[PDB]
Amino acid sequence: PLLSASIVSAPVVTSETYVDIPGLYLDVAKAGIRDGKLQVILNVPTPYATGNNFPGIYFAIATNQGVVADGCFTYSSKVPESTGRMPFTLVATIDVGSGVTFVKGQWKSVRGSAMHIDSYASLSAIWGTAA
Amino acid sequence: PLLSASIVSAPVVTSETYVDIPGLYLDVAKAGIRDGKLQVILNVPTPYATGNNFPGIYFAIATNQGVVADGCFTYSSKVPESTGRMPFTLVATIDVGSGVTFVKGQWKSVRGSAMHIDSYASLSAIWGTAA
Amino acid sequence: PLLSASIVSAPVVTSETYVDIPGLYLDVAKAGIRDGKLQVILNVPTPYATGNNFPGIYFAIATNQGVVADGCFTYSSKVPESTGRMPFTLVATIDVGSGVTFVKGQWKSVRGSAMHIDSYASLSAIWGTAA
Ligand SMILES: C[C@@H]1O[C@H](NC(=O)c2ccc(-c3cccc(CN)c3)o2)[C@@H](O)[C@H](O)[C@@H]1O
Ligand SMILES: C[C@@H]1O[C@H](NC(=O)c2ccc(-c3cccc(CN)c3)o2)[C@@H](O)[C@H](O)[C@@H]1O
Ligand SMILES: C[C@@H]1O[C@H](NC(=O)c2ccc(-c3cccc(CN)c3)o2)[C@@H](O)[C@H](O)[C@@H]1O
């Protein structure tokens, strides 16, 4: 009933759209889970953003149906003196009965920001069923 | 065994006391849960605070018995150049056997701050029983 | 199936190595859990760091086998005007079958920082077994 994927880095990218964070992927269908609920946690404890205009990163939890939940961090200065690490966690509960076969973490730039993961990050789920 | 409530906004308020975040409410009694433990996650991934004196927000998890756990974020400048988004997660485990009928997220101003949610936020619980 | 430990303070320390956060300890063996998986959440919602050189704190989840996962927060200024509270959550899933008898939260200084907890912090686990 516990699913988990974790990474320690990702190639630095920018994106104006949500794009997969490589490695943060849970295959629900492959685990034989076809109904009930998943409580999903995207945990990016040590990201940073680089950019010229109050940098930050949007993160999402997505399924094959798209983004279920999202949020961001942003710095409080236009060009931070140093881009500090800004812990980020997002939590969503999904109905698998809706047609879900996978869960992924995604990211999007804030204002053109380059997006950095260079240490542990995780995607976690707990499956709960009323049966 | 998985409970969830989520919002995308709340009216902007100030408060010197913990006050409910509208919509972040789980009715435990209504789910027929009267004993065991709940692991509760309050997830406010994208809040900001506005104010004149090192702004921030306190968040709590509360039951009908009151606040079980709380914490805050605060900015590192007196009047931030821009009030950046400051991800916030709080996690507490409650004994339902103690007399619990609901769980809520609450917020309180730091130093007079106006409190802002204008995107996804969640309250989640997993029920665990030794029986 | 739900384990939890929580604190409201810890003596202020520095460390160049990961050192236990007193009180954030889960005894897995004592609970008779010897296989399956644990989804562990370290939740430090209100820490701050004090120091002279872009302060911050590293946090880890560790077992008797060592650190499984870690991350940090850091400020974006060399000597913050005020050291604001920087919420921190870390999530990891552990195989108990690997030889695990306890789970702990740990911390390490960033750049010599003194490490501060003076309010609620938690260590949480959910045990999941395929049996
Ligand atoms: C952009 C700057 O990044 C610096 N950190 C690192 O360069 C770094 C390199 C490896 C790690 C790192 C992190 C978390 C867990 C671990 C352990 N695998 C390792 O951090 C910060 O100190 C600074 O404040 C800035 O944000
Ligand atoms: C106060 C400023 O707020 C800005 N963001 C927004 O005005 C905004 C409007 C909708 C959203 C928003 C957030 C997270 C997920 C989603 C998607 N539903 C949408 O953000 C920041 O960029 C800036 O750094 C400051 O903090
Ligand atoms: C270092 C400064 O610390 C200040 N907060 C406190 O001195 C304080 C003392 C007790 C608490 C505190 C926190 C969270 C939950 C609770 C409730 N038990 C209580 O905070 C900040 O306001 C400021 O921005 C700075 O970070």
Residue numbers in the entry:
A (entry chain A), B (entry chain A), C (entry chain A): 1 to 131
Could you share sentences copied from the article?
BC2L-C is a new type of lectin from Burkholderia cenocepacia that binds (mammalian) fucosides at the N-terminal domain and (bacterial) mannosides at the C-terminal domain. BC2L-C presents a double carbohydrate specificity, with a Man-specific carbohydrate recognition domain (CRD) in the C-terminal domain and a Fuc-specific CRD in the trimeric N-terminal domain. Thus, BC2L-C can contribute to adhesion and colonization by simultaneously binding bacterial mannosides and human fucosides, and it has been dubbed a superlectin. We have recently described the rational design and synthesis of a first group of antagonists of Burkholderia cenocepacia BC2L-C lectin, a candidate target for AAT against this pathogen, which is associated with fatal pulmonary infections of cystic fibrosis patients.
